[PDB]
Design a protein around this ligand. Structure first.
Ligand SMILES: Cc1cc2nc3c(=O)[nH]c(=O)nc-3n(C[C@H](O)[C@H](O)[C@H](O)COP(=O)(O)OP(=O)(O)OC[C@H]3O[C@@H](n4cnc5c(N)ncnc54)[C@H](O)[C@@H]3O)c2cc1C
Ligand SMILES: Cc1cc2nc3c(=O)[nH]c(=O)nc-3n(C[C@H](O)[C@H](O)[C@H](O)COP(=O)(O)OP(=O)(O)OC[C@H]3O[C@@H](n4cnc5c(N)ncnc54)[C@H](O)[C@@H]3O)c2cc1C
Ligand SMILES: O=C(Cn1cccn1)Nc1ccc(O)cc1
Ligand SMILES: O=C(Cn1cccn1)Nc1ccc(O)cc1
Ligand SMILES: [Mg+2]
Ligand SMILES: [Mg+2]
Lengths: 305, 305
């Protein structure tokens, strides 16, 4: 059995691709992962996804997406793809000890937001801990919050957040910043931002919601506690391109490269969508749009064969 | 009063831009038009917009979008922009006898699908008359339908539709096709497609739904009726770039050009989203994604000023 298309991933990109591919009668085979449903499965309210005047929880939205794909005939498998062979007319994916083949493959594996890896970070996610100022910054009006990170990301998150927060404490483990000079001086100029260099978070405290962070000086080991009600983690993003490295061309940070304003990768018959590709917008709606484009690309490419 | 941003247009691009801009506290001023709500306001069921497992009508979806934008503080005006001055630090839009100014402008004016302009075409829209095989082709399984047009669009629509339709009659007013050779021969090879050259539709018949088309030979004037239950119009798209022609760079078909994979146009402070830009995918979800990108571009550009 060689399927028309296999989709790898189950966030907004993968499900929107599945919906279009299934409605186009391509009978898409979709490997969702055991941690299925993408990044929104790990948040609370999604308010900026257009179509929901009163908002919707992340898992609610993602299950609508999933049931929609099922209704049009997508074959969904809650399993991880462990290896792929993407070159040539017949592509193979390996899932444990099982193999599946297709003429076209849509890569929708997303990007992981780097975690601090400290106690309290996972439990207080959506309860004071966030990875996205555009997404959740709204909810921290007149509060004291922290932003963790030393790059342009952290700089942009911290400066953006000062239009809501009472104060923003920007925490970085070194005394040097990898942020561009312009981004670093914008934050320095902002009166609502205080810099804590040579500082790491060791724990996030909070009884149902974030109430404070425990800090450590990375040079002296001095520790203290900071009273805050928000923690924005901006220590970077890792595109999940490990499966396809050495097969599809990646950029220097691991993102899958695509041709022009399409989803075509460097390999014939292989298309890529979502935050696996986009290091600029990183929203559910942009990921959803690009998964629709990937499926239209694939259908058009399949018709050419 | 100089606003931070003005949005021109009220389809999925404009409303998604409004939602993001309003949630970012930019207080966007949005000119929706008197024919507000974009192309979906003129369809029935929207089934491929991810997030709705049982589908949603076009006007239902668009009003969710509109109320969502209002809830975050967008200032919506149901009025046409009649002229713009987009160059320089302060941009102006003219609405009848009123003027409004902003530091940033997001162009979201969409594209008009060319109409046949015949009796019955508007009344039977969403009732047998369609402009989008990807959108509505699903609903014509085992029926006899027509596709009107002579380009790659019509070719692609006609060939795609044969996976649903019993038969597809492809109607064109000349005996020559502007479609590329590959697209024209794909349709010629398809056994479910019959070509009617030198033929125009003069009227679409239908008591609540399409039941037939009246035809005329454009050379001899011979007329006849064809029994069909679907009419797909694929005579082209016209981007609504008339406002900005001579100010923003357009491509040879009138679409607004943007830089790379962003929404930046050729003019500082001017961004463009949706089907005004995209001549490739033309879906609500892709338009919605690109209006989110336009607002993120604008916010980042405003912060740089
Ligand atoms: C906490 C949080 C809150 C957010 N809130 C918002 C918000 O309110 N609004 C908004 O617009 N955006 C929000 N985002 C961002 C948004 O969720 C992402 O931009 C979007 O989900 C990206 O979609 P994607 O499909 O490219 O990838 P992802 O969402 O990462 O989905 C990819 C999926 O594919 C699976 N997958 C990966 N590799 C494999 C494999 N080998 N085999 C099988 N499956 C695999 C993954 O496990 C994952 O389930 C939030 C993100 C986070 C982390
Ligand atoms: C009949 C039909 C059915 C469709 N069905 C589907 C479907 O099921 N699924 C799908 O994904 N897509 C569907 N589409 C396509 C989808 O609607 C479009 O791709 C999408 O709406 C494009 O959004 P946009 O915001 O770029 O522009 P548009 O939707 O065209 O919206 C632009 C809006 O801005 C307004 N505007 C323009 N100029 C001005 C001005 N000067 N001043 C003020 N306002 C102005 C316009 O009047 C319009 O209301 C359908 C299209 C049609 C025509
Ligand atoms: O950097 C990490 C973990 N990591 C994940 C991938 C690579 N590193 N954590 C961290 C924790 C507290 C802090 O203040 C700064 C950073
Ligand atoms: O071309 C048009 C109208 N038009 C709109 C913009 C430019 N032309 N109509 C048409 C009607 C029947 C037919 O068979 C083919 C075409
Ligand atoms: Mg996930
Ligand atoms: Mg309209």
């Amino acid at each position: 059995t060689v399927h028309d298309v296999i989709i790898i991933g189950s966030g907004p990109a993968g499900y929107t691709a599945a919906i279009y591919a299934a409605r186009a009668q391509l009978k898409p085979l979709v490997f969702e992962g055991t941690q299925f449903g993408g990044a929104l499965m790990t948040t609370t309210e999604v308010e900026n996804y257009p179509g929901f005047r009163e908002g919707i929880t992340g898992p609610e939205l993602m299950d609508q997406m999933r049931e929609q794909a099922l209704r049009f005939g997508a074959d969904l498998r809650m399993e991880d793809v462990d290896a792929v062979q993407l070159e040539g007319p017949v592509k193979t994916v390996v899932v444990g000890d099982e193999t599946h083949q297709a003429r076209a493959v849509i890569l929708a594996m997303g990007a992981a937001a780097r975690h601090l890896g400290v106690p309290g970070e996972e439990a207080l996610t959506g309860m004071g801990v966030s990875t996205c100022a555009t997404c959740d910054g709204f909810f921290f009006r007149d509060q004291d919050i922290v932003v963790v990170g030393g790059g342009d990301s952290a700089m942009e998150e911290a400066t953006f957040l000062t239009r809501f927060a009472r104060s923003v404490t920007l925490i970085h483990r070194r005394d040097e910043f990898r942020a561009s000079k312009i981004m670093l001086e914008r934050a320095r100029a902002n009166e609502k931002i205080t810099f804590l260099t040579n500082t790491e978070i060791t724990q996030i405290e909070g009884d149902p919601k974030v109430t404070g962070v425990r800090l450590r000086d990375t040079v002296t080991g001095e520790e203290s506690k900071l009273d805050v009600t928000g923690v924005f983690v901006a220590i970077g993003h890792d595109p999940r391109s490990e499966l396809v490295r050495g097969q599809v061309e990646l950029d220097d940070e691991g993102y899958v490269k695509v041709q022009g304003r399409t989803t075509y990768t460097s390999l014939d018959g292989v298309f890529a969508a979502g935050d696996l590709v986009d290091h600029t917008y990183r929203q559910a709606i942009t990921a959803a749009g690009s998964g629709c484009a990937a499926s239209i690309d694939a259908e058009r490419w399949l018709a050419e064969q």
